[PDB]
Amino acid sequence: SHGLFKKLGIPGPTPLPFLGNILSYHKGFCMFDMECHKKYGKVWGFYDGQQPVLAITDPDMIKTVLVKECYSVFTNRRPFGPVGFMKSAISIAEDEEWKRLRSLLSPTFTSGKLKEMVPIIAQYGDVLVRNLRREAETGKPVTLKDVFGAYSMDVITSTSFGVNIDSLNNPQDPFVENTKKLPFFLSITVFPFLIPILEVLNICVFPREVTNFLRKSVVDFLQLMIDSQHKALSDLELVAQSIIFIFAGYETTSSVLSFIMYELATHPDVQQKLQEEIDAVLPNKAPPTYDTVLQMEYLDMVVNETLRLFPIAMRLERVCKKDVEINGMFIPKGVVVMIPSYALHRDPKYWTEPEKFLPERFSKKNKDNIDPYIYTPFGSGPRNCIGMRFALMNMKLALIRVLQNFSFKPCKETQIPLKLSLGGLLQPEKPVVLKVESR
Amino acid sequence: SHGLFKKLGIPGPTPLPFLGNILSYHKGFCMFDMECHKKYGKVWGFYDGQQPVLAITDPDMIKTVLVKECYSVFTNRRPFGPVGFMKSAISIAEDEEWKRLRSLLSPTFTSGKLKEMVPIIAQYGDVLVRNLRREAETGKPVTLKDVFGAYSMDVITSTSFGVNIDSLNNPQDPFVENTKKLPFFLSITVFPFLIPILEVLNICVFPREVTNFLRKSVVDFLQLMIDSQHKALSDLELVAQSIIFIFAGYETTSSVLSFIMYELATHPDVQQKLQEEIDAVLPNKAPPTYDTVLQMEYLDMVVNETLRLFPIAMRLERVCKKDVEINGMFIPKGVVVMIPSYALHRDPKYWTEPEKFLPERFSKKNKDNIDPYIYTPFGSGPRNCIGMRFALMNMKLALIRVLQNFSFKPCKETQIPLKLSLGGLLQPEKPVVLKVESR
Ligand SMILES: CC(C)c1nc(CN(C)C(=O)N[C@@H](CCN2CCOCC2)C(=O)N[C@H](CC[C@H](Cc2ccccc2)NC(=O)OCc2cncs2)Cc2ccccc2)cs1
Ligand SMILES: CC(C)c1nc(CN(C)C(=O)N[C@@H](CCN2CCOCC2)C(=O)N[C@H](CC[C@H](Cc2ccccc2)NC(=O)OCc2cncs2)Cc2ccccc2)cs1
Ligand code: HEM
Ligand code: HEM
């Protein structure tokens, strides 16, 4: 298959037998995407082992793939190794199975249901401040990843199961043992023929401890999914969607929050301007609500600029169902089409000083000079992030309460400039540690 | 997956882990189909390893699968182990790739093109008689499988490539060496996860000698396929369809002819009545033509009754693309639906004395008391045997010339009653040997 892109006339790095271009991932596939963008242009191809992958950076062509030709050609993502029963998760399901799960789960992420989840998940803001109050009296740096990981865990557990744990001060609740389990993954691309082997060996990507407990354990997601019971639902599928929410509500929410605090501490001018906006909207540590969170323009600008610098999905991907000719280029069946979000967010073409953290990019004035198909932190089209608004509301409620009571400064232990780990996840190379003061 | 049919309420034999019901194939899957039909009824399910297979015998439900719901749900067959480039063969291709190959190849099997192929393939009838004249003067039994295999090989080679070999008296032509290559196949069902392994090991089901020669070697099929050059064609695909024709034109044609002669020798009353019909239509060894072959009613009755007793495909199969409820029964996605042709052809319900060779079943009178979805020797629907009329014309031209000059009687070496081999192909357990006289 290594002669497909040279047959179609698409430029790209020459692949090695069996491996393809995977050795070029040694610097991280984000840097690989940037270098390929810099020397090839709007379109290039490469091989994850034997799998051809076509990268596209044209906004019109990206809209055609993510939106216009979604249900017909670009419906599904590229599958991974052993999935087990998680094949019924919405982010993994395909074609009409995904369409069914999308319809059953879409009302669960309504603005109305989100407005009902605000008074519940705000109670853990009072918990996060106290969990941050005690660790701030030490006078020594704090690992936000844990204090945020605790808060984020408290949210998914409460607004999906009513399990009101204090995850930090309770490493004992039966709903914290299993959640605690949320080199190999690269041997899948050289050996894609091994996936059917692991699907009969039942080696899932998780321990047997996790899924067996949640299967029995099976306003909140669990209710609203049982409330709305292609049209049909099942028992094991209910656990699959629950697992998909927990990883998202934990790893993504806490990672972005840690990224935001690093930018707020290393840019204290932005931090005060945010604290002053929060004070003018919520006088003297006033409790935030749904209606008042949407009122903070500069808070929305800070979150958007962090997600530009650190788009935790890095890439969007779709599998070509059939043959197609999109915006003047032929794409054969089986090719994975990929949108390099990280590279596009840092493209010197569309961005002035892309490496700079400049929240004013997303002010009401310039926000219009932003192509929604270059800046895609939540994807786009019928299969974008279904929990975008919940994620934005969750992180902002955390930032308001944390900044209403505390200020954040760097340390000798803080990694400046921050470097990104060269793994499969977009996260800091070393944990973000910051000096925490109070007011 | 072994709990699917008991969940849907469908009866069937209890499967063993890993194996499913494959041990029940020890008596041949034809007998397994008959026994399951006798004790379960219209519908039953079983497992080829982990693969659920649903058998159906209702004519209305069979028409729904083979015809009415073909393009939407039941488009493709059940794939096998390593296919290599043969995935582009029409009998193996899927969905829109098959639809494209079906359109490009359908005019090649037109009655008009067949009428043009008659004067060419009839010249080998003059060759078959001479190849049967010399072996008949021995006074010792003959193996029709070889004399027919020679004739059949001469036909595909001439009416697809103009390669006018005398395959019997020329084991030297470069077009006979490769064609000569036309336990393991059961290890595929217990280990379906090994197919992706063999697709990268490139171990095809053929030697490397065969495909490499035909790829370079690449009225007749080759012309008409290049003449008509989704709409597009390719080089390696041209060889794939050529290989699919050669196996069909050889193994099926000679096997049925051997089955016909066994029935004609063991029923000499049918043999004389056929010889008298041929004489009244073609006076004194007259040369047969297209228009005069269709004029022999009793010849058509003999061929149809042999194909009833020995339907060489044995089973028709379709893969369920989605979920469906057909003629009052729900079929989930992934289930292979199977029509047991051999069992239905010998069902005491629709057939009086099914084990008897009675050509009068297909007389113009009773031919109407025959459900076309119980008697399916060439399948039915958009994916039936595309070469049905060529196969019927080819075998009949062989029978006319062979019976215009010879008569056939059994021997001490003849296996009476004939037993079928318990392999994967429908062929005699031991070769059909018959005494050959002349006139
Ligand atoms: C190694 C390198 C060459 C890479 N190869 C890729 C290919 N590649 C885009 C993925 O498929 N990588 C997977 C991660 C696992 N590997 C490793 C790389 O090879 C095989 C696939 C990925 O993470 N994909 C998700 C699938 C589900 C994941 C994690 C998970 C797994 C099992 C059970 C539960 C969760 N997350 C998830 O449940 O979504 C929640 C979120 C919502 N919002 C942000 S996350 C599909 C997905 C879903 C949403 C957003 C993005 C992606 C990348 S780097
Ligand atoms: C062992 C037992 C449990 C069985 N499991 C099946 C499943 N099963 C219905 C098939 O798929 N078995 C294959 C035979 C190979 N195995 C063995 C069983 O497991 C895996 C599949 C079969 O023969 N299928 C054909 C595929 C192509 C074949 C032979 C061939 C293979 C490679 C290159 C070229 C030819 N023939 C063919 O090219 O067609 C020409 C004809 C036209 N007219 C009569 S033949 C699909 C097909 C096409 C036409 C008619 C019927 C079927 C059965 S018994
Ligand atoms: C900062 C937080 C988050 C970010 C940046 C993010 C980003 C993304 C992105 C880029 C995609 C892929 C969109 C595409 O391929 O077009 C995605 C998919 C998805 N996300 Fe998120 N996500 C976040 C949090 C969440 C949360 C909290 C949930 C649920 C509680 C969630 C649920 C999903 C699901 C289910 C999908 C797959 C949708 C489908 O396949 O139909 N995500 N997310
Ligand atoms: C006595 C001779 C033959 C018999 C009994 C026979 C029987 C069959 C049967 C039962 C099928 C499956 C139909 C279905 O699944 O609905 C089939 C398919 C097929 N046959 Fe034949 N066949 C014969 C000879 C031939 C010949 C001579 C050719 C070509 C030269 C041929 C080409 C094909 C093809 C291409 C298919 C697959 C069609 C598709 O998938 O679109 N067959 N045959």
Swiss-Prot record, chains A, B:
Question: What InterPro entries does its record include?
Answer: Cyt_P450 (IPR001128), Cyt_P450_CS (IPR017972), Cyt_P450_E_CYP3A (IPR008072), Cyt_P450_E_grp-II (IPR002402), Cyt_P450_sf (IPR036396), Cytochrome_P450_3A (IPR050705)
Which terms in the Gene Ontology molecular function aspect does this entry carry? 1,8-cineole 2-exo-monooxygenase activity; 1-alpha,25-dihydroxyvitamin D3 23-hydroxylase activity; anandamide 11,12 epoxidase activity; anandamide 14,15 epoxidase activity; anandamide 8,9 epoxidase activity; caffeine oxidase activity; enzyme binding; estrogen 16-alpha-hydroxylase activity
Consequence of substituting F161S = In allele CYP3A4*17; exhibits lower turnover numbers for testosterone and chlorpyrifos
What GO terms describe the biological role, i.e. biological process, of this protein? aflatoxin metabolic process; alkaloid catabolic process; androgen metabolic process; cholesterol metabolic process; estrogen metabolic process; lipid hydroxylation; lipid metabolic process; long-chain fatty acid biosynthetic process
Please give the CDD domains that the UniProt record associates with this protein: CYP3A (cd20650)
**Which reactions is this enzyme annotated as catalysing?**
an organic molecule + reduced [NADPH--hemoprotein reductase] + O2 = an alcohol + oxidized [NADPH--hemoprotein reductase] + H2O + H(+); 17beta-estradiol + reduced [NADPH--hemoprotein reductase] + O2 = 2-hydroxy-17beta-estradiol + oxidized [NADPH--hemoprotein reductase] + H2O + H(+); 17beta-estradiol + reduced [NADPH--hemoprotein reductase] + O2 = 4-hydroxy-17beta-estradiol + oxidized [NADPH--hemoprotein reductase] + H2O + H(+); 17beta-estradiol + reduced [NADPH--hemoprotein reductase] + O2 = 16alpha,17beta-estriol + oxidized [NADPH--hemoprotein reductase] + H2O + H(+)
- Tissues/organs with expression: Expressed in prostate and liver. According to some authors, it is not expressed in brain. According to others, weak levels of expression are measured in some brain locations. Also expressed in epithelium of the small intestine and large intestine, bile duct, nasal mucosa, kidney, adrenal cortex, epithelium of the gastric mucosa with intestinal metaplasia, gallbladder, intercalated ducts of the pancreas, chief cells of the parathyroid and the corpus luteum of the ovary (at protein level).
Q: Which cofactor does it need?
A: heme
Annotated effect of mutating G28D: In allele CYP3A4*7
The alphabetized UniProt keywords are: Disease variant, Endoplasmic reticulum, Fatty acid metabolism, Heme, Iron, Lipid biosynthesis, Lipid metabolism, Membrane, Metal-binding, Microsome, Monooxygenase, Oxidoreductase, Steroid biosynthesis, Steroid metabolism, Sterol metabolism, Transmembrane, Transmembrane helix, Ubl conjugation
Effect listed in the UniProt record for changing I244T? In VDDR3; 10-fold increased activity towards calcitriol; no effect in protein abundance; decreased activity for non-vitamin D substrates
Instruction: Report the EC number(s), separated by commas if there are several.
Output: 1.14.14.1, 1.14.14.56, 1.14.14.73, 1.14.14.55
Query: What triggers or suppresses the expression of this protein?
Result: By drugs, such as rifampicin.
Instruction: Describe regulators of its activity.
Output: Activated by cytochrome b5.
Its localization reads: Endoplasmic reticulum membrane; Microsome membrane
- Give the note: Chimeric transcripts, characterized by CYP3A43 exon 1 joined at canonical splice sites to distinct sets of CYP3A4 exons, have been detected. All are possibly produced by trans-splicing. The chimeric transcripts exist in 3 different combinations: CYP3A43 exon 1 joined in frame to CYP3A4 exons 2-13, CYP3A43 exon 1 joined in frame to CYP3A4 exons 4-13 and CYP3A43 exon 1 joined in frame to CYP3A4 exon 7-13. The longest chimeric isoform (CYP3A43 exon 1 joined to CYP3A4 exons 2-13) exhibits 6-beta-hydroxylase activity, while a shorter isoform (CYP3A43 exon 1 joined to CYP3A4 exons 4-13) does not.
Q: What does this protein do?
A: A cytochrome P450 monooxygenase involved in the metabolism of sterols, steroid hormones, retinoids and fatty acids. Mechanistically, uses molecular oxygen inserting one oxygen atom into a substrate, and reducing the second into a water molecule, with two electrons provided by NADPH via cytochrome P450 reductase (NADPH--hemoprotein reductase). Catalyzes the hydroxylation of carbon-hydrogen bonds.
Disorder this protein is connected to according to its UniProt record: Vitamin D-dependent rickets 3: An autosomal dominant disorder of vitamin D metabolism resulting in early-onset rickets, reduced serum levels of the vitamin D metabolites 25-hydroxyvitamin D and 1,25-dihydroxyvitamin D, and deficient responsiveness to parent and activated forms of vitamin D.
* Subunit details: Interacts with PGRMC1; the interaction requires PGRMC1 homodimerization.
Q: Which family does it belong to?
A: Belongs to the cytochrome P450 family.
Q: What is this protein called?
A: Cytochrome P450 3A4
